[PDB]
Structures are given as C-alpha cells and as structure tokens.
Design a protein around this ligand. Structure first.
Ligand SMILES: Nc1nc2c(ncn2[C@@H]2O[C@H](COP(=O)(O)OP(=O)(O)OP(=O)(O)O)[C@@H](O)[C@H]2O)c(=O)[nH]1
Ligand SMILES: Nc1nc2c(ncn2[C@@H]2O[C@H](COP(=O)(O)OP(=O)(O)O)[C@@H](O)[C@H]2O)c(=O)[nH]1
Ligand SMILES: [Mg+2]
Lengths: 432, 430, 36, 46, 43, 54
C-alpha cells in the first residue's frame, strides 16, 4: 500500500513537521495521543501498533538538542517515538563543511537505521519526503551526505525535496551563499524533484492576502503544509483522477537535469475577504498564474512554461477544469515552449482542504495547487552567483571551511556546476 | 551537554563577574544560598551550561576566581551573592603586580599558573562536552592584563578547538587611571591577536557616557557600570540556554563574524537602555529597538563606526516578536546607509532570536559588530606606547624582571601590522 | 552490498562484540562507508 | 466486516456527493457561512 | 610493441570560460536600486 | 543527571519537564506553546497486548 517516510532535517525541517504532522493528525482524526476515538486512509503516513494505535513514519534530525528537545515536552510528546527524534551535542553552526565532514559523520550511521527500520515496516514504499534548508549547515551539510547514501541505498525510490532557498535580499546569515552554491551538487545528481521555496514570497503573500500584517514562522510553515497535503491528497483519499508521485514526475521533467518546478497554492484569503468573493474553478486557476502569488521571487512572464502539473481538490468537476484550461491557453501573456503543445496533467480529489483552529485561511469548499516547470527560475541562481562571486574573490570566510578539512578547489568546481546548469535552462528557452 | 567555564582575573575581572553571576542567578531563579526557587520549568532546563550540581539540591557556578592579591576576594565574599561560589575555586597568592605586566606574566604569575590549571582542568573534565571558556579582565592592570593572558596562552595549547571569549576592558584616551597603561596594553593585545577566538572591547569612558545619556543617573557607581557589562555577557549566550524560533550559539556567532583570523575585535551595545524620563513617553516596538541599537552613542567602545566600514553586524534578540519586522528593519539600516557597510559582503547582518526576554522586561536585543573603526584604538595605543618607549621611560621596572627589550619591538610591530592590514580591508574595491 | 533489510544493515557494522565494551548505539553501528 | 463497511461508506458518501454536486449553485459557488462567521469572531477575539 | 614503447605526446585542452548568465548585467544595474549614503546614521 | 549520555538521548530534566504556559498573557510562554497549546487535554497512556489462545 502507498506509504511515505519523511526525513525532516534541521530547524527549518523540524518546525515544518510541527505544522505538517499536526495537519495530518487533524485531517484523519488522530488525537494528540495518537489514538482514534472512532478505510485505511492513514496508512500512507501512519502505522499500526500492538496497542491499536497509530505512529507516523517520520524521522526528525538536528545537530542541536533544544529545537527538538521541546517536541519531547509539548502536547505531542506522546505521539512520536522517543528514538525517532535524533539530536546532537554540537551543531554545524552555519557551516556546510562541519556538517558534511566532521560532526555529521558521527550521526549518519544512526539515522540510516531508523530510515531502514521505518522502511521495512512499510511494504510498498512510494517515496521519501525530505525537508531541509539551504542556509544553515546541518540542513545543507548533513542533509547533503544523507542523500549521497540514500542514493546508493535506495536507487529506485523517489526522493522529493522541499527546501528553503536563500532569499535575494533578506536573510538570517552572512555565510549563507557558500552553503547554497555548494549544496546544489547534491540536489542535482541525487534528487528526483525539488521545490526551492523562498521566505520573502510567502512574506509577501501573507501580508497582501491573509491580512496578517505581522507574521512569524508558524504563519509560514502552515502554507508549506498545505502544499505537501495537496500532493499526497491523491494517495490518502480517492479521486476522479488520482495522481501518484510517479505520474507527476513523468509529466513535469523533460530532461534529468531539469527537475526544478515551482509551487503555487490558491485560494489564500481571509474570511472577511472570502465573505465578498465567490470562488470558482476559473477564479482560483487565474490566481495560480499571477506572479504576485508565485512562491519564488521570479516572474514566469520573463520565461516560458515547459510543463505544468495541476492538482485540484474539493468540490470540483472535470467539466469546469477543461473550461478553465481552455481560457488559460488563450492568453498571450502565458507562453509555452515550442515542443510542448499540451502541457497539462490534471488531478482531481474529493476531500476539501481541512482547516486548523488557530489558523489563518478560511474554510473553502474548493482549491487548487500548481506545479509549473518554467525557465524563469534560472534568474534566481544568477543572483546567487553574483553574490557568491563578489565574496569568493577576496577569499572571505574560506579559513573556516578549509581548516575544517575540505579542499579549496571544491569551491570553484561548485560554482561551475551551477554555471553549467544555468546554461542548460537557457537553451530550453531557445525556440527553433 | 554544552558547558562554559567562566574564567576570572584581576580586580576588574572579579568585580565584573561578581555582578555577572548575580544577574544569571536571577535569570535562573537561584537564591543567594544556592537553591532553586524559580517558578517556570524552563528556568531549570539548560542550567547545566554554567551551574554544577551539588548535593542537597544546590548549584555551584563553574567559576575560577584568580587574582594575585587576596584583597578583592574579601569584598567578593562580602557581597550579596558572596558565598554562592565554592571556596576551593578561589586561587590567589601573596604579592601582586602593582600594575606591572612583567611581574604578573613572568616572575609571580608563573608560580600561580600551575594551581589555576588544576582547578580549570578539574572543571573542564567534569562537564561532558564543553563549548569553551570565558575570561573577563582589564588591559590596564597587572594581573588580568598580565598572568590573565598567560592563562589564555597555556589553555589554547591544551584545548585548541574550544572557543575562548574575552570581555576585555581596554584603556581610555581621555582619562587614564594607570601611567604604565600603554606598556601593558600594547603587550597584552599581542597575546590576544595570536590566542583568542573573540574579544569584546569595552571602554569605561563610553560606559560613563551611556549612564548619563540614555539613563540619566546622577551617581552611577561601578556597580551600575558592571551590571551594564554583565547584561551584554548574558545576551550572547541567552540563545544558548533558552529556546528560540531562530537560535544561535557562540560558535554560530563566531563563524559569521571573523572573515579572516586576524580580526576578532568588536564593539557591543544593549538595546532597551531606557531613561527614567523617557519611559513615560515611549512605545516599545521593534523599529524603536533597532533605532537605538545602531545609534553610535549606544556603543560601549571609544571608536565611532561612522568613521569606518562595518564588516559584519550581529543582532541577538530577546523576547517574542514578529520576524517580518525583524527582517525589514535590518534591511532598512542595510540600504539607507550604504557607505558604512563593505561592498564585497552582501547582507552584512546576522540575526538571531531568543524567545524568553530578560526577567522583568518584554523586549530587548544585543548588538555585536566588527568594524574597521576599531583600528583607531590600536594606533592610539601605539603612539602612546611609542612616545613612552622612545626615551626608555618606565622601562627599568620591566627589564629588571629579566625581559629583554626586543618583545616591545615585536609587540608593536605586530600591532602596527594589524592596523595596516585593517586599513587595506577598509579601502578595498568590489 | 545492498542491505535490503534492517538485520543485514546492522549485520555489516564494524563492532567486534568481544573487544568493544560499554558503547552506545552510534558506536555499535559504525560503517566503512561512513568512515570513508 | 470492514470490507462491507467500506461499501456502505462509499454508498452514503456517493449519495451525499450527488446531493452536494447536483445543486449547480452550491457546486460552482459555495461557502459555509456559519463557519466563516465563527472564524471571523475567533479572529476578532484574538 | 616497439612503437607503443615509444613515449607518446599528450595534449589536453583547458576547456573554455564558464557560462555567464543573461541577466547578470541587469543584476549589476539593480545593485544600486535603493542603497543610499549616510541617510540614517549620518555623517 | 551527571551522566555522559549517549548521542540521541533526552536530557534528564526534559525527560519530565513541563512546558511553558500556553496562555499568551502569562510570562515564559514559548512560541511553540502559543501555537499549539491545549491545557484541557491529559493524554491517556493507551497500551494493550495479548490474545494468544484466541
Ligand atoms: N521558511 C522557513 N525557514 C526557516 C525556518 N526555520 C529556519 N529557517 C531557515 O533556516 C536557515 C538556517 O538554518 P536553520 O534551520 O535555522 O538551522 P539549521 O538548518 O539546522 O542549520 P544550523 O543553524 O547551522 O544548525 C535560515 O536561513 C532560515 O531561513 C522556518 O520555520 N521557516
Ligand atoms: N568596568 C569596570 N572596570 C573596572 C572595575 N574595577 C576596575 N576596573 C578597571 O580596571 C583597571 C585597573 O585594574 P586592576 O585592578 O589593576 O586589574 P589587575 O591588575 O588585573 O588586578 C582600571 O583601568 C579600571 O578601569 C569595575 O568594577 N568595572
Ligand atoms: Mg540550525
């Protein structure tokens, strides 16, 4: 049966799982203890025990206790296996190098068991969901090495990637470009899909749409939970056109070097604003193409779509979806590559999105998610190349990474790999 | 877990850290007897970072009080939190230095080094995974500026990887309280430039300034000065002890602040230093916090960053806030003042939050900034040392201890190496 | 050399039971691919 | 037992599905006004 | 053989300069969009 | 408490420590607790086994 194991890495990874796993518990009726008060829709994430109780298929990792230490104390202390949440003594401390060669290697071995022990409990594994961050060391370094071993251990399984890309203007770190340029090799030859999402765009969307003038990370994690929920909504509950993880990989990736879609979710409105606006299938799918609602700070109007994956959910009908598809095609603002005359893969699900008390979104009878592989993303890396280049020229912060025990030649090589990848995306933008 | 051994040297070191252990006792809800009387459960969750468990439910600070004279230790014991320290940590000798760097470093401290190493190694072994040590001293004395550096040089050889912080007190130009001040200062900073991970430059004349300017205190005693310094020391490791939405440690702050190994000198500041006239007319909100943060008057050094270029800026926040305003207001200072930040490092500011504010307060932050304006301190010490070293003045005291004259040459050549290398980073093209 | 099972995962660790004494979990599971 | 329970669950679920779907008004345009009102009040309280 | 025992010449190319992004000049133009001198701290 | 502890291990204080106050008005309230705090919920210690002869 379809099952997915989540491999949350780092503080960003740990905190996102707090929003995700509370969302899945409330979706299926899991009480915070883990026991039903009341068919097997929960087998994609949970597993049954000898006591008649459900345990998620998650593995929380961090290189410092206090982020995960709280989870062992709060309301879900009795929901997750006390060994499922692995911590450390010393952290990478915003350093890909320490988390890749020195501190991580002590705890690569331990997590690779609980990955395996959660794997044998599953019969047919569908994929691995990986949450990490490009900025910090542990979410970049130890995250990178665990894919290197996961690649040669699980050569056929699907490894999905949700990650925080370093933002073009704001950030919480100065040393953050060095990790970002060097992590890209691991998510290039050791991943199957990638969903780099940026905090400023979620910051922009939350203020403009959700009326929240002053958000925090919980207001950001909740939308990330909605996107992953939409992807797996086909698996957990039935659908008119159920789309598994293998299907949307097929109709998004033209070439193995091109596995960087962009995510979009709609509608995201407050109840007062949802009070004075009807939400139809056409309305939300027009909002899925607004550059003000893209979750990456790039404008798709500067590029062209090569592949677009659809995911509707709620009270939707195939008659209206085909109506909304036709109108979008008749829009010269939206461009398409020459060799893709039909670029749509539509998924329909019954169950409407569930709402969380203490949340922000209104309860809506229908929604839509968007996974469009566009070539406008190649501008995001070009910004990173410039900032990395003007830092690397005078050789700043190199003493930290080299003195750890990594060779300085890997710095230049890593810059070349992104340089080669950027050229590949622009060649697709060329039309015959 | 993640433990710190608080070193201590000299009258400045003992008097500063006497206040420091009180303010962290209040943060952790510990009575002068030493027992736990707090109410929140997080007040004792990471207490092992500093405190050591004793039988009967008591706690002993992991301090090592060192001074060549037994004088101030009587006053230390006679303080309000006097007997919280276990007596075996008090290490002392017969005859002090008398503001003589030579006697402390060579002829008298070399007898006292072995005993201190015994206590330090005893505390070092007890903790499982110690992050590092922490030394408070003054550069204008004989012991903290003297043997206080010899403790630094020995321990670095024993433990290379551990972090060593130094909340040093540098002498001030306008009013000095020691006449051989530049002799000890120019020869102690050579010890820092080779063996130190970070140093925070705290100057008293700035501290005397802030009390009148931002607090309007008619009679600020040295207790109010020492509490002002100790609020900074808590603010760097608050994220170490208490959980946060976005956390940081000493090492996380270490990596992002030194671009090159020669540069580990900063100028700190404390945000909610609010005056007793201004609490009535105020609105506690985060732009007002970062407004007072970056005002150069709020620095506790004798250098003006408006004269130089900010290399990297740290902002360690305390309290529960909304981070959008934290990211926006940092960006506003980043771009509105372009010329004070270096061009080859984009996003020169690092931010960190700690959920729990200081006790009795709602919002706070502390600032650590690496600036090229600190080179105005070194040249000033260099000239004041050279002019005193031209005529062989006050030198018979030092060379009579057996030191040759040549270390003064290399201590000032290394020092003038730093100012030239600092200058080239200021005038550098992107 | 693909483990394909938890038992065969722990069956390839470098920890001689006779010599190795009083270790924790991470010391029990140590792999040559990790020590690379 | 659960095998036939699944059949009955699909049964009443498809019946309520046709009841909600066939009303074109609620299918193309539908909000739970009481739920929106409740969350509006909760937001105001917060 | 007698001809493979003869040492053989080896020439290898150093490749070519890496790809430069098309938006790089736009980025360099945008680097000074909002930055201002001593507007808040002062001179 | 004074032990060295293995690598992935709960600290002795936090093996049993209670979280901060869930109510935003009271001090020592964490962001996690204010985001997900439920005072009126004591988790049942559900556990059951057996069933051999059946
Ligand atoms: N979107 C989002 N990003 C987060 C969140 N928490 C942390 N981050 C990102 O994580 C990056 C830094 O890494 P952290 O997650 O804080 O910590 P880490 O990944 O374990 O790396 P280290 O701090 O070195 O241990 C920052 O750039 C943040 O953007 C979150 O809740 N939401
Ligand atoms: N900030 C601060 N500085 C102090 C205090 N007490 C002494 N100092 C400084 O310490 C210097 C003299 O230190 P000294 O007693 O000679 O240190 P020692 O030789 O190591 O014992 C003076 O320049 C003072 O400015 C204090 O309580 N607070
Ligand atoms: Mg981290």
């Amino acid at each position: 049966m379809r099952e997915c194991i989540s491999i949350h890495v780092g503080q960003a990874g740990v905190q996102i799982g707090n929003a995700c796993w509370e969302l899945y518990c409330l979706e299926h009726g899991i009480q915070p203890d883990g026991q039903m008060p009341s068919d097997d829709s929960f087998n994609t994430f949970f597993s049954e025990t000898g006591a008649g109780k459900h345990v998620p298929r998650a593995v929380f990792v961090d290189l410092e206790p206090t982020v995960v230490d709280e989870v062992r104390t709060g309301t879900y202390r009795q929901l997750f296996h006390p060994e499922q949440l692995i911590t450390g003594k010393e952290d990478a401390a915003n350093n890909y190098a320490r988390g890749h060669y020195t501190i991580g290697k002590e705890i690569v071995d331990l997590v690779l068991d609980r990955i395996r022990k959660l794997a044998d409990l599953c019969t047919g594994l569908q994929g691995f969901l990986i949450f990490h961050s490009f900025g910090g060391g542990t979410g970049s370094g130890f995250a990178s090495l665990l894919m290197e071993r996961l690649s040669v251990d699980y050569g056929k399984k699907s490894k999905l990637e949700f990650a925080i890309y370093p933002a073009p203007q704001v950030s919480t770190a100065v040393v953050e470009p060095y990790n970002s340029i060097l992590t890209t090799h691991t998510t290039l030859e050791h991943s199957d899909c990638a969903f780099m999402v940026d905090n400023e765009a979620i910051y922009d969307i939350c203020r403009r749409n959700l009326d929240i003038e002053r958000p925090t990370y919980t207001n950001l994690n909740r939308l990330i939970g909605q996107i992953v929920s939409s992807i797996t909504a086909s698996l957990r509950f039935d659908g008119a056109l159920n789309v598994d993880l293998t299907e949307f990989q097929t109709n998004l990736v033209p070439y193995p070097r091109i596995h960087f879609p962009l995510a979009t979710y709609a509608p995201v409105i407050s109840a007062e604003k949802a009070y004075h606006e009807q939400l139809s299938v056409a309305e939300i799918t027009n909002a899925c193409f607004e550059p003000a609602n893209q979750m990456v700070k790039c404008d798709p109007r500067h590029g062209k779509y090569m592949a677009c994956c659809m995911l509707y959910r709620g009270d939707v009908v195939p008659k209206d979806v085909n109506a909304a598809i036709a109108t979008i095609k008749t829009k010269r603002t939206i461009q398409f590559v020459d060799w893709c005359p039909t670029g749509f893969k539509v998924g329909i699900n019954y169950q409407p999105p569930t709402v969380v008390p203490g949340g922000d979104l209104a309860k809506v009878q229908r929604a839509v998610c968007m996974l469009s592989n566009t070539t406008a993303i190649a501008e995001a890396w070009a910004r990173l190349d410039h900032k990395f280049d003007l830092m690397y020229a005078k050789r700043a912060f190199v003493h930290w990474y080299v003195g750890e025990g990594m060779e300085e030649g890997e710095f230049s090589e890593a810059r070349e790999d992104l340089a080669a990848l950027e050229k590949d995306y622009e060649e697709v933008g060329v039309d015959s | 877990m993640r433990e710190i051994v608080h070193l201590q040297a000299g009258q400045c070191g003992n008097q500063i850290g006497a206040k420091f252990w009180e303010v962290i006792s209040d943060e952790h809800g510990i009575d002068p007897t030493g027992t736990y009387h707090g109410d929140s459960d997080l007040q004792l969750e990471r207490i092992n970072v500093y405190y050591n468990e004793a039988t009967g439910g008591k706690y002993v600070p992991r301090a090592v009080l060192v001074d060549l004279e037994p004088g101030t230790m009587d006053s230390v014991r006679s303080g309000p939190f006097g007997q919280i320290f276990r007596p075996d940590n008090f290490v002392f000798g017969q005859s002090g230095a008398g503001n003589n760097w030579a006697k402390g470093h060579y002829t008298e401290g070399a007898e006292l080094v072995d005993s201190v190493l015994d206590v330090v190694r005893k505390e070092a072994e007890s903790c499982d995974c110690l992050q590092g040590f922490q030394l408070t001293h003054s550069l204008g004395g004989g012991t903290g500026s003297g043997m206080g550096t010899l403790l630094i040089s020995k321990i670095r050889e024993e433990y290379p990887d551990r972090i060593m912080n130094t909340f040093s007190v540098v002498p001030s130009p306008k009013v000095s309280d020691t006449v051989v001040e530049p002799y000890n200062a120019t020869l102690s900073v050579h010890q820092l430039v080779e063996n130190t991970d970070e140093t925070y430059c705290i100057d008293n004349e700035a501290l005397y300034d802030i009390c009148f300017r931002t607090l309007k205190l008619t009679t600020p005693t040295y207790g109010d000065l020492n509490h002002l310094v100790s609020a900074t020391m808590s603010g760097v490791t608050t994220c170490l002890r208490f959980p946060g939405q976005l956390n940081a440690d000493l090492r996380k702050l270490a990596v992002n602040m030194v671009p090159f190994p020669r540069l580990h000198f900063f100028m700190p500041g404390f945000a909610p230093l609010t005056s007793r006239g201004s609490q009535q007319y105020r609105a506690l909100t985060v732009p007002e916090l970062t407004q007072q943060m970056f005002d150069a008057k709020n620095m506790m050094a004798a250098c003006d960053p408006r004269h130089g270029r900010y290399l990297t800026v740290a902002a360690v926040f305390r309290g529960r806030m909304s981070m959008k305003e934290v990211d926006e207001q940092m960006l506003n200072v980043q771009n509105k003042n372009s010329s004070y930040f270096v061009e080859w490092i984009p996003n020169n500011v690092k931010t960190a939050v700690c959920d729990i504010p200081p006790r009795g307060l709602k919002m706070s932050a502390t600032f650590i900034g690496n600036s090229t304006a600190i080179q105005e301190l070194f040249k000033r010490i260099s000239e004041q040392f050279t002019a005193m070293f031209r005529r062989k003045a006050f030198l018979h005291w030092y060379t009579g201890e057996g030191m040759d004259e040549m270390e003064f040459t290399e201590a000032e050549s290394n020092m003038n190496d730093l100012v030239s290398e600092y200058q080239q980073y200021q005038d550098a093209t992107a | 050399k693909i483990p394909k099972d938890d038992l065969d995962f722990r069956l390839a660790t470098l920890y001689n039971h006779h010599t190795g004494a009083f270790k924790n979990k991470t010391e029990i599971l140590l792999h040559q691919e990790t020590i690379e | 037992p659960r095998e036939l329970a699944a059949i009955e669950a699909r049964r009443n679920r498809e019946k309520e599905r046709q009841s909600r779907f066939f009303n074109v008004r609620n299918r193309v345009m539908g909000v739970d006004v009481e739920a929106l009102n409740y969350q509006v009040e909760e937001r105001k309280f917060r | 053989s007698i001809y493979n025992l003869i040492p053989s010449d080896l020439k290898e190319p150093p490749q070519h300069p890496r790809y430069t992004s098309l938006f790089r000049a736009t980025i360099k133009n945008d680097m000074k969009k909002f930055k201002t001198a001593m507007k808040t701290m002062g001179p | 408490m004074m032990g060295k502890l293995p690598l992935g291990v709960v600290s002795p204080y936090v093996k049993m420590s209670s979280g901060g106050c869930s109510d935003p008005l009271k001090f020592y309230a964490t962001s996690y607790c204010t985001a997900y705090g439920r005072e009126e919920f004591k988790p049942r210690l559900g556990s059951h086994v057996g069933t051999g002869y059946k």
